[PDB]
């Protein structure tokens, strides 16, 4: 098993999303949300909500566990282990995003660590504020990289499209799609 840089995927993205089309750009958004439902589906948090932020980027936010706060080695963060070296999700989008804002909540603080160009962090992951012991969640929000992608534009009804199914295969689990450049929003949540 290999480890490789971010700037592996750069180089050939269609190895990992498929193509850098419509097709390959909404893949960086089922592989963040496939997070969020992964961390619902082992019972941690019964909402995800993802926004199509005006500017163009967009954001999954969940209510689990958050992701590890602590330290990797030579101090650094697991966090950034996990967006920085390809194994494998999270470090594709990354590296295929001209930004990227991972935002962790857990015992009673909050952290955040952002990585420009590419992947390249120009923080590290530091504690931004604090907020209930109750409160828990991971949150990113990242802008695709246009120089890499022939369409940069998120699909509204193809990601509410997915978050329905996701929210059916999930059960008592509650989705919504916001979409801040029209305004439109929906919600999805099955019982069993
Ligand atoms: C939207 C989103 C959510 C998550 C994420 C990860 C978690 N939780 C874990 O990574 C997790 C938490 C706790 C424990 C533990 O053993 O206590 C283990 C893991 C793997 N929740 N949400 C991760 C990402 C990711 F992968 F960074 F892109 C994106």
Known sequence: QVLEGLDAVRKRPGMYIGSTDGAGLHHLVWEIVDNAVDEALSGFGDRIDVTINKDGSLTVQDHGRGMPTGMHAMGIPTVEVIFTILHVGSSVVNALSSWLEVEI???????????????????????????????????????????????????????????????????????????????????FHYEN
């Open 105 to 187: 909540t857990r015992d009673g603080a909050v952290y955040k660590q952002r990585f420009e160009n590419g992947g390249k962090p120009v923080t590290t992951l530091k504690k931004i504020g604090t907020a209930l012991k109750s409160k828990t969640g991971t949150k990113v929000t990242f802008m695709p990289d246009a120089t890499i992608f022939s369409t940069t534009d998120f699909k509204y009804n193809t990601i509410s499209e997915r978050l329905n199914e996701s929210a059916f295969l999930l059960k008592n689990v509650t989705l919504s799609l916001t979409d801040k450049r029209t305004d439109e929003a929906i919600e």
